[PDB]
């Protein structure tokens, strides 16, 4: 207070005693920074104004700022410095400009760079307006040249072009062929840089470099490693399509080579990373201060880790020879650990690393702990220090991001790092309930792009044998008097909790949480926890807990991938709907592509990514095994997954397994799981339940046992198991009277499922219709929802009663009555009820279109039409996408009479016109199915609404529409009807995205050369009299012309440079003019041909003479030809 107030008072004193200048000089030279900091204060404001009215004072001001700009670098300090330099005396317009360009112009803060741009522009304007004998005096001969040389040596003359032009004005007043190697050099001009500007375009560029010299191009010290992850990604899109990708294989060899290379620079003996103070242990830490301590190497570890994560996230779906070899695995593991340590190192020395680098390191860790080859390495004993460093760095990063100083993470032999890692993994495992629970009161300190990564990494690390045994023990057991002597080839193998230490409800709840979160790492651990749960079962409410834990544990075996690894696996699904026969035809095989694109985007936008840990967008996969089993690829389950579960939700639903999969996989004409005898658990639970519910068993346990049976029946394998299930549930219906409260919810669907599995007959499975109808008339919906689930089970493939068909109207009238009310209100109602209702209705319409007809299957389309058109608030998104996908399966399946089918193809036009981009993309998929299934001016309306979506959609929706447009165009009607429209949409001003329309034009033009339209293209190009060359952004005019002549080219290596042209949409540099001249000339010589057409071309250019450069240099090139 005294310092600043005294400076202000002294400034006010100098303002008035201005005749003397020693106090002014002293103030400036000694307190320039305080003057700038306090410049908002009126006496200091007046002092600075008085400095502005004095050439010598202003010169002292500038001389003092030149020697203090070190601390005037802060955004606020620099903004104030500019506010002070603004009104500087004119006699110093050469000094302040020198300071501007030498020091303040190249700032990472762009708004201050702009301020400096404006102020320097004015300083030159003033030098120009002031007469010559003084302008030459303030700005010397070589000083102006050095200013221009700093602006040109740096890339600063290109960001601030007006300043360079003004300096040029001041000095003026003061006195190839498109071949393989040209393309390779042009790509090298863009990809041998170090820049994250055009990664996708640079990947599409290096893709066209020949395969014989592509691996030698990505492996020089100049190749931008930022391109490796795009090149892999793009490469994957050419292996997912079915081909072989040289891009992917070359990028993979380069990525693994670079990983081995950087691992080679690590020390030979590895010591655990510990953040406390790694200086005491050894001279190892000197080397690790030199290694990732500089930037030449630290700025290559996350760039390499992004590529490695892009590779590791797709090795689960690659051809066998594209998996990582067993020799590199140790390498990879070390790299992962090192990357995390690098990140932790950066945290200790230089603040937060980088949202991208952090994500890359945690992605690598997450993905490596999911691969068996890498897990089995880091899980071993030779890699105990690496697993310990993983635990230490993960805990360190989580605390450095989420825990404020003064708070704790959780808020209510045997080296010490082994115990430290055990306790840290246990703490992080307990943090999965509050701190790392996405959407919990305590996840607000975690930025939510680290939360799934951290959850998955923590589960994976808690399954390591070094810490697994410790982690499975509740801390409420350490608080009791339990501490045995451990030893397990590490020193931390603990015996499992004794059941005397499980009879308390709290300890048992903690133990169940542990075993459900961590899963089981082997058959031995599964059997141990199975015996433990049984011995607990053999008390008040412990039996409910034990039965629920038992059914969770047996469901853990159902997960198709890595037997019981929650981090890698989700509950296996077998959908009730079947693969549609409309596809696998001619037009269905094209709809497959055009709709798979939209499906990938809908998955990226709305899917809950429950089975997906990392951020990678196109990672959707469903837990559906071939059963003919490997997992069925996501592009083969287009409209197959059960319509009543949310997109990307992987939890347990009533209907996980279709009865067809029961009758098929374990052939039951109507062994065990992955490594674990689930048949024995099946029979044990069947007997223990068939002998526990019939004989003083309280109802609250009857309900839980019936729930557990309903769940576990997904694991039954033989017909006698379902038979015992059904007999038990029938005898329980007889024993337990109308009093259920909570039993029908699980009794009715378990009964109906078992009855359906037994090839439903009127022999014993006849009286399911009775309690089905009885259950649809209830007071609480849960029983009715279980009834609808049982209805679906029984409607799957079981001819109802084998005689009587009253059940189908019994269902359909319930559906038609209860759905029609929920169209003006859907939020006030239950989502699950609506979803199972629509699922039932769609299955009826598709598999039973005989009994349904007048009232059903036509009014259902009305239910869906009024649901899809509801407001974004009134119709939730999960109901919207369910109804839309069910309508799309009803449409693509030919089980509709052609007055509701058409009543559906006209339901698609109103829904693309919504603001929400995901609803718009869903509507676009529905529209594409209406188009491809029901197959002149209607198609014109459709292509127009597509172009309108490009014009007024967000860049994602627009990019997707632009990606699907070329196929749609050359699929539905001839090019002559669109080569106007599309060109008009590439040649427009209201078009927000010319860079997408450029690829659209390119694809259309290159698809012209299919049946022999390699001449219509030059005809439509010569139709550039009015449209082209009339574009007020001359830069955009020459850019669009270059793009159009790239698109209209029959020569290779020049049609392959479009992403190099789209990469610079403005940017009228001279290399761009040279590229435009070369491309227009390659269209002149090879294409035109007619000598009179050469002249019709040449006299379209000089209309817009532009003698400067865009068209004059082109006209010159044509004269040279």
């Amino acid at each position: 207070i005294v310092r600043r107030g005294a400076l202000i008072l002294f400034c006010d004193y100098v303002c008035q005693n201005l005749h003397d200048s020693e106090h002014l000089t002293w103030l400036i030279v000694n307190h320039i920074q305080d003057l700038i900091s306090l410049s908002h204060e009126p006496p200091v404001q007046d002092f600075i104004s008085a400095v502005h009215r004095n050439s010598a004072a202003s010169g002292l001001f500038i001389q003092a700022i030149q020697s203090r700009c070190e601390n005037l670098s802060t955004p606020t300090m620099l903004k104030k410095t500019l506010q002070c330099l603004e009104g500087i005396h004119l006699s110093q317009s050469g000094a302040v400009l020198t300071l501007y360009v030498d020091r303040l112009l190249c700032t990472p803060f762009r708004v201050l760079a702009r301020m400096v741009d404006i102020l320097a522009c004015r300083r030159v304007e003033m030098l120009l307006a002031a007469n010559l004998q003084s302008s030459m005096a303030q700005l010397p001969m070589e000083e102006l040249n050095r200013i221009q040389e700093y602006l040109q040596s740096s890339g600063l003359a290109q960001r601030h072009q007006r300043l360079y032009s003004l300096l040029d004005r001041f000095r003026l007043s003061t006195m190839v062929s498109p071949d393989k190697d040209w393309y390779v050099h042009l790509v090298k001009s863009q990809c041998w840089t170090r820049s994250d500007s055009a990664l996708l375009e640079g990947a599409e560029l290096v893709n066209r470099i020949p395969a014989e010299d592509m691996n030698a191009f990505m492996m020089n010290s100049e190749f931008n490693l930022s391109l490796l992850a795009p090149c892999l990604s793009l490469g994957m899109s050419e292996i997912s399509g079915g081909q072989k990708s040289a891009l992917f294989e070359a990028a993979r060899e380069v990525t693994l080579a670079r990983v081995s290379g950087t691992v080679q620079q690590l020390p030979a003996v590895h010591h655990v990373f510990q953040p406390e103070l790694p200086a005491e242990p050894a001279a190892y830490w000197s080397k690790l201060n030199d290694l990732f301590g500089d930037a030449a190497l630290y700025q290559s570890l996350p760039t390499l880790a992004r590529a490695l994560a892009q590779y590791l996230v797709v090795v689960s779906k690659l051809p066998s020879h594209l998996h990582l070899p067993p020799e590199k695995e140790k390498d990879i593991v070390k790299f992962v650990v090192a990357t995390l340590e690098a990140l932790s190192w950066h945290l200790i020395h230089e603040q937060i690393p980088l949202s991208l680098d952090l994500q890359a390191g945690l992605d690598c860790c997450c993905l490596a702990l999911q691969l068996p080859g890498l897990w089995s390495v880091v899980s071993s004993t030779e890699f105990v220090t690496h697993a310990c460093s993983l635990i230490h760095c993960v805990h360190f990063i989580l605390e450095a991001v989420a825990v404020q100083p003064g708070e704790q993470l959780l808020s209510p032999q045997n080296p010490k790092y082994i115990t430290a890692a055990c306790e840290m993994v246990a703490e992080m495992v307990e943090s999965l309930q509050s701190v790392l629970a996405l959407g919990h009161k305590r996840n607000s300190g975690v930025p939510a792009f680290l939360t799934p990564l951290l959850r998955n990494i923590i589960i994976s690390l808690a399954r390591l044998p070094l810490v697994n045994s410790y982690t499975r023990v509740p801390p409420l057991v350490w608080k009791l008097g339990w501490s045995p002597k451990p030893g397990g080839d590490f020193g931390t193998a603990f015996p499992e909790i004794p059941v005397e230490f499980l009879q308390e409800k709290e300890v048992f709840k903690e133990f169940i949480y542990r075993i459900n979160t961590l899963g089981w790492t082997s058959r031995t651990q599964f059997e141990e926890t199975w015996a433990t749960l049984l011995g607990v079962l053999v008390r008040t409410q412990i039996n409910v807990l034990a039965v629920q834990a038992i059914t969770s544990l047996v469901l853990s075996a159902m997960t198709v991938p890595v037997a019981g690894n929650p981090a890698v696996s989700c509950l296996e699904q077998q959908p009730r709907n079947k693969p549609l026969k409309a596809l696998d035809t001619r037009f269905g095989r094209k709809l497959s592509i055009i709709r798979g694109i939209v499906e990938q985007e809908i998955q990226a936008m709305v899917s809950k990514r429950e089975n997906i840990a990392t951020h990678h967008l196109y990672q959707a996969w469903d837990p559906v095994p071939s059963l003919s089993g490997a997992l069925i690829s996501h592009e083969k389950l287009l409209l197959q997954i059960n319509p009543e579960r949310e997109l990307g939700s992987m939890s347990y639903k009533l209907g996980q397994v279709s009865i067809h999969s029961v009758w098929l996989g374990n052939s039951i004409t109507p062994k065990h799981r992955a490594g674990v005898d689930i048949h024995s658990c099946s029979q044990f639970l069947l007997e223990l339940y068939s002998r526990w519910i019939l004989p003083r068993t309280p109802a609250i346990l009857i309900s839980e046992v019936v729930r557990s049976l309903l769940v576990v029946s997904d694991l039954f394998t033989e017909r006698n198991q379902f038979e015992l299930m059904y007999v038990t549930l029938t005898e329980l219906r007889r024993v337990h009277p109308s009093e259920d409260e909570i039993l029908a919810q699980y009794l009715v669907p378990a009964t109906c499922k078992a009855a359906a599995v037994l090839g439903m007959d009127k022999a014993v499975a006849e009286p399911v219709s009775r309690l089905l109808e009885s259950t649809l008339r209830s007071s609480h919906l849960p029983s009715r929802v279980g009834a609808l689930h049982g209805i679906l089970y029984v409607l799957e493939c079981d001819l109802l009663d084998d005689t009587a068909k009253q059940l189908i109207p019994v269902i359909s009238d319930y559906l038609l009555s209860n759905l029609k009310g929920i169209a003006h209100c859907v939020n006030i109602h239950s989502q699950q009820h609506v979803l199972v209702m629509c699922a039932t209705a769609f299955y009826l319409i598709e598999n039973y279109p005989l009994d349904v007809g007048p009232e059903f299957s036509a009014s259902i389309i009305q239910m869906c039409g009024v649901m899809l058109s509801g407001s974004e608030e009134s119709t939730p998104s999960i109901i919207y996408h369910c109804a839309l996908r069910g309508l799309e399966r009803l449409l693509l399946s030919e089980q509709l009479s052609r007055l509701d089918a058409e009543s559906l193809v006209k339901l698609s036009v109103d829904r693309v016109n919504v603001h929400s981009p995901h609803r718009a993309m869903a509507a676009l998929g529905l529209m594409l199915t209406c188009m491809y299934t029901g197959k002149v001016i209607v198609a014109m309306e459709r292509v127009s609404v597509l172009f309108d979506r490009i014009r007024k959609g967000f860049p994602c929706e627009a990019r997707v529409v632009a990606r699907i447009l070329p196929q749609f165009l050359d699929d539905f009607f001839p090019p002559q009807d669109i080569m106007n429209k599309v060109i008009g949409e590439f040649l427009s001003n209201q078009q927000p995205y010319p860079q997408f329309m450029a690829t659209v034009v390119y694809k259309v033009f290159q698809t012209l050369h299919s049946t022999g339209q390699s001449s219509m293209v030059r005809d439509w190009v010569m139709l550039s009299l009015s449209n082209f060359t009339q574009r007020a952004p001359v830069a955009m005019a020459t850019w669009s012309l270059s793009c159009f002549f790239v698109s209209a080219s029959t020569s290779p290596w020049v049609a392959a440079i479009l992403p190099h042209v789209i990469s610079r949409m403005g940017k009228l540099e001279q290399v761009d003019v040279n590229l435009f001249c070369l491309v227009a000339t390659d269209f002149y010589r090879h294409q035109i041909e007619e000598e009179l057409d050469r002249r019709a071309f040449q006299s379209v250019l000089e209309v817009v003479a532009a003698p400067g450069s865009p068209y004059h240099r082109l006209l010159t090139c044509l004269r040279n030809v």
């Binding site: 955004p75 708004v111 996708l200 603040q351 959407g439 459900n516 969770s552 997707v960």
Partner: protein, 244 residues
């Protein structure tokens, strides 16, 4: 009367406890969750009773309870729906309580990755805070205004709506972060300068500047806004919608 409302809300609270136990407290990968529906039905009956008795604030409090439970259980979208329900119930008597509920709804929309919905809720919040916050907001509304402003700028930089579909509110905000002459508003000077630099760097396609600003802005932003800024940087480096 109100005692029945008390019985119903205290039943729903135990139901929500039981659902939290069956789902989160002791993770159960075999439960779809029954007590959540029972709690929802009880809370709905209690809300309707309170609305009949002339107590929209108690009904909004129950809606807030249900919304917080839904967001806890990993259902962000239904949570945002119920948060907006409560905000509408509170709106023309407790603008600040409604602004808190709408902030919860916007957080839940960002959890669900519904960025246009979150942008819409943020703009509605900024509007309501300007109308009820009095230039020179009251201070309880100034916090809302600062959050909604930073979040709207980040969401507009993420979405990048085309000039055709771009509301006057969005354009009026975005033009404020272009600089032409020597203004920060309700925002601190340093954060406002970094936000202006961020807008100008995402417009001029300067990846290195965006990375520097990401690191500089990390301490100044909440973790929600740090997520938004990370998404802006990622959409800049790796755009969505390309399929590769």
């Amino acid at each position: 009367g109100p005692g029945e409302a008390l019985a119903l809300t205290e039943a729903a609270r135990l139901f929500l406890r039981q659902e939290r136990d069956a789902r989160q407290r002791l993770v159960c990968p075999a439960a779809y969750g029954e007590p959540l529906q029972a709690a929802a039905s009880a809370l709905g009956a209690a809300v309707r009773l309170h609305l009949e008795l002339g107590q929209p604030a108690a009904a909004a409090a129950l809606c807030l309870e249900l919304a917080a439970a839904l967001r806890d259980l990993g259902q962000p979208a239904a949570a945002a729906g119920h948060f907006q329900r409560a905000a509408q119930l509170q709106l023309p008597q407790l603008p600040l309580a409604a602004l808190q509920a709408l902030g919860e709804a916007a957080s839940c929309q960002l959890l669900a990755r519904d960025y246009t919905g979150a942008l819409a809720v943020f703009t509605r919040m900024q509007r309501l805070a300007r109308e009820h916050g009095s230039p020179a907001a009251l201070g309880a509304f100034s916090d809302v205004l600062v959050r909604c402003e930073v979040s709207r700028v980040l969401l507009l930089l993420l979405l990048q709506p085309p000039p055709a579909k771009l509301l006057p509110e969005h354009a009026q905000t975005l033009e404020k972060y272009s600089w032409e002459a020597f203004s920060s508003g309700q925002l601190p000077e340093e954060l406002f300068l970094l936000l202006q630099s961020l807008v100008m760097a995402t417009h001029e396609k300067d990846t290195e500047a965006i990375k520097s600003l990401q690191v500089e802005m990390w301490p100044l932003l909440t973790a929600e806004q740090n997520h938004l800024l990370h998404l802006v940087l990622q959409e800049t480096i790796s755009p969505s919608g390309q399929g590769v």
